[PDB]
Design a protein around this ligand. Sequence first.
Ligand SMILES: Nc1ncnc2c1ncn2[C@@H]1O[C@H](COP(=O)(O)OP(=O)(O)O)[C@@H](O)[C@H]1O
Ligand SMILES: [Mg+2]
Length: 408
Amino acid sequence: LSNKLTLDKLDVKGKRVVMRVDFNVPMKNNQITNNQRIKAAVPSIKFCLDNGAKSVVLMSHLGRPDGVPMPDKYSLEPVAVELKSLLGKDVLFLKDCVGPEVEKACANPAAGSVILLENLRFHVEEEGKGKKAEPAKIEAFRASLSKLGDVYVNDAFGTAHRAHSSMVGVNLPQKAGGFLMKKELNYFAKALESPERPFLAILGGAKVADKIQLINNMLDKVNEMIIGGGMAFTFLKVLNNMEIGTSLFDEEGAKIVKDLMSKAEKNGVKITLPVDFVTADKFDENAKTGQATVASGIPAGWMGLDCGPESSKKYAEAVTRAKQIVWNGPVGVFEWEAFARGTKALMDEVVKATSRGCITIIGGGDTATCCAKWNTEDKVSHVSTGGGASLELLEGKVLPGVDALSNI
Ligand SMILES: Nc1ncnc2c1ncn2[C@@H]1O[C@H](COP(=O)(O)OP(=O)(O)O)[C@@H](O)[C@H]1O
Ligand SMILES: [Mg+2]
């Protein structure tokens, strides 16, 4: 951010501040399971209020409602409640994020007002697609958001890889990076400058279509890569002709698997894929469970939701060799006890590695929740609010949310 406006240089006195945050927090049984991402924005929010901001209007997405209002499933209302406790101030929640009624709520607020808008992705104009997109409405959506403040702050590190309307399209004269954006970028700048080697990337989780497309460039930066979680099945189906049942599979990514493996070979990147699994008869906490290996395949109508013990051993071996690790994506559905062992075991190993001097970086809305669940947040080097955003920094890219900020 050396050439970007940041919040420490933004005059907020008497100003309405419209602020993009990443409040895309994990939810289970409808409750917030980790408030990490909300707590992480509090320093910027408090700074604005302590320095005389007239208001702070907070906007985020939650999940992927795909441009349709889904207040039953993906409302940010619970976040407003949580933010109250964390701030020490009350926060007014609006049931939309644009236009007439929201614009009036934000036009001239009482001094010190904190306002949280509803899920930006209830409108197809945020992402620009759903559910297909339309330029004049996209422009109009961005215009509306811009009226909600006099100055703009982006503290949404976790979303900074998304060139979405709220992230790159707000038109106000001063667009400043917040303190979380600064903290995260500064950490990664230093950690990625001259990594300790071997440098291992651990890629798991879900969102396989997105994550598989990051591997090509990551292969130029790391010395080893664990490909686990939901992403492994695309690789195993292609490379081993493994039956994968109903496990996550990315048709598009499947087409580049062999090219990625070629490139890993060319670059001397050792790829560790799982070799065994805990299977489920459906995507449910209380599914019937089984075991499978790559040789056995996964039966029809069953899905692999965790790696098995033989995979955990191979993952542990990669971790023991590492002097630096970036981990994004649990290696199983760790939210459900039946499918949590692989991720706990990997967590144990990553903690052990830190203790003997490994630089260990865990990132993501869900992967950071692994740290919270097993009480390891202060037992690794850094826990980032960014998952994909962090992987994009590892690739060596500028994040669109940062690029869109005002130059100094
Ligand atoms: N084999 C699997 N099949 C389906 N989902 C999985 C599997 N392994 C992990 N997951 C899920 O991936 C989800 C989070 O992945 P992701 O969003 O990519 O991570 P992060 O939010 O840290 O970037 C977790 O909710 C976990 O339940
Ligand atoms: Mg996630």
